[PDB]
């Protein structure tokens, strides 16, 4: 994926609810640092729905590709109010950005 294109997507569609940096604040949504290779619902200090807390999957490229297409379909009951990114290539670019920015 294209990290620069992914950053733009993140800024436009995600940043208002999410920070990525280590120690970043929670906003409407949880800070995302450390997301890759961890189960759903594990950001310290964030109050998740039971739906996100108990989804029982590990985040990675494949599960983020599915989730970001349509969050409510993957996690019914989620309080992330976002319809999804419909284009597969845009999801891949965003995910490549996230794999860098949430791991720095
Ligand atoms: C505010 C309106 C949001 C927007 C825009 C985005 N997200 Fe979000 N996200 C939000 C909330 C409130 C939550 C918790 C939902 C719950 O039911 O408890 C989330 C959750 C996620 C997660 C899961 C995190 C985890 O399990 O630890 C991910 C991976 C995620 N959000 C990513 C993400 C992306 C990449 C966004 C832009 C496309 C995006 N979110 C937008 C709130 C909001």
Numbering used by the authors: 1 to 104
Give excerpts from the publication:
Cytochrome c (Cytc) is a small, 104 amino acid, essential protein with a covalently linked heme group that performs vital functions in both life-sustaining and cell death pathways. In the mitochondrial intermembrane space (IMS), it acts as a single electron carrier from complex III to complex IV, also known as cytochrome c oxidase (COX), as part of the electron transport chain (ETC). Apart from respiration, Cytc plays a key role in intrinsic apoptosis, where its release from the IMS into the cytosol allows Cytc to bind apoptosis protease activating factor-1 (Apaf-1), activating the apoptosome, which in turn activates caspase-9 and the downstream caspase cascade. Using purified protein and cellular double knockout models, we show that K39 acetylation and acetylmimetic K39Q replacement increases cytochrome c oxidase (COX) activity and ROS scavenging while inhibiting apoptosis via decreased binding to Apaf-1, caspase cleavage and activity, and cardiolipin peroxidase activity.
To mimic lysine acetylation, K39 was mutated to a glutamine residue (K39Q), which is a polar, uncharged residue like acetyl-lysine. As anticipated, given the longer side chain, the K39 acetylated Cytc demonstrates greater variation at residue 39 compared to the K39Q Cytc. While the glutamate mutant may behave similarly to the glutamine mutant in this publication, this is not generally true for other acetylation sites, and the glutamine should therefore be considered the acetyl-mimetic. It is worth noticing that Cytc purified from ischemic muscle exists as a mixture of acetylated and unacetylated protein, while acetylmimetic K39Q Cytc mimics 100% acetylation. The maximal oxygen consumption rates using recombinant K39Q and K39E proteins were increased by 38% and 72%, respectively, compared to recombinant WT protein. Interestingly, the caspase-3 activities of recombinant K39Q and K39E proteins demonstrated a significant decrease of 90% and 87%, respectively, compared to recombinant WT protein, indicating that K39 acetylation protects the cells from cell death. The cardiolipin peroxidase activity of recombinant K39Q Cytc was significantly decreased compared to recombinant WT protein, ranging from 17% to 60% decreased fluorescent signal in lipid vesicles composed of 20%, 30%, and 50% cardiolipin. In line with this, the cell line expressing acetylmimetic K39Q Cytc showed reduced levels of Cytc pulled down after Apaf-1 immunoprecipitation compared to the cell line expressing the WT. This also translated into reduced cleavage of caspase-9 and caspase-3 in the cell line expressing the acetylmimetic K39Q compared to the WT after treatment with 8 h of staurosporine, a potent inducer of intrinsic apoptosis.
